[PDB]
Amino acid sequence: DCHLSDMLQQLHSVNASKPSERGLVRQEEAEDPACIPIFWVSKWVDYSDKYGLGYQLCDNSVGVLFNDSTRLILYNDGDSLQYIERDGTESYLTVSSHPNSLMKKITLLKYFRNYMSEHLLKAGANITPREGLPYLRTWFRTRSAIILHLSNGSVQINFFQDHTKLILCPLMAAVTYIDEKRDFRTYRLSLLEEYGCCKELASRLRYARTMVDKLLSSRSASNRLK
Amino acid sequence: PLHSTM
């Protein structure tokens, strides 16, 4: 979308400046806690082999991007639901009300919800979200990470090997980095271009740029079908 | 089969 192109531009400016190749990196000067995201994926389970990918957002809401490209979201009130068609057309409803055509998917979502709640850790549990519902537009995995694209423009990348995570927010042109110790820091990308960053964050930002392009390529392919 | 950190 438009956010993807904005994010690509933001990442370009930083990466082109080679932030880790500076005389004296001052990463801390680019910090801005006020730019912490409102939403990010706290956990996910990939059962795309049969039903789809379930996930939980940091506000405790749950969602599932089924294999037929449709999405069902269950708000943290445990009753309000939002259904998004392949097109993107959304519809509001609740569990209490029994929209017959959605009972199967609602039931599937609940099993996903229970599994995640019982077996998985909540990423960013030590983070207080920013004051304010998006759905998972698309996702894919590489040999080293899972890429998650939210409908609000945010792109999240979870790295498998060291459990580090990147949350890119185009509206605020910012990025939140969670290290393996679960410590988190939020940076304004424009300040990173100015003050630089360590080689690790630099490497991940280069990879992120590559992942954003892959999202654009997938979208161009998916568009050819619609 | 595949999931985030347990």
Residue numbers in the entry:
A (entry chain A): 371 to 502, 508 to 601
B (entry chain B): 1 to 6
Task: Please quote the paper that reports this structure.
For instance, polo-like kinase 1 (Plk1, a member of five Plks), a validated anticancer target, has a unique exterior surface (polo-box domain, PBD) composed of charged, hydrophobic, and hydrophilic domains whose phosphorylation-dependent protein-protein interactions are crucial in regulating mitotic progression and cell proliferation. A large body of evidence suggests that PBD interacts with phosphoserine/phosphothreonine (pS/pT)-containing motifs, and directs the N-terminal catalytic activity to specific subcellular localizations. The polo-box domain consists of two different binding regions, such as the unique, broader pyrrolidine-binding pocket and the conserved, narrow, Tyr-rich hydrophobic channel, among the three Plk polo-box domains (Plks 1–3), respectively. The N-terminal Pro residue on PLHSpT is crucial in conferring specificity by docking its side chain into a unique hydrophobic core (hereafter called the pyrrolidine-binding pocket), which is surrounded by the Trp414, Phe535, and Arg516 residues.
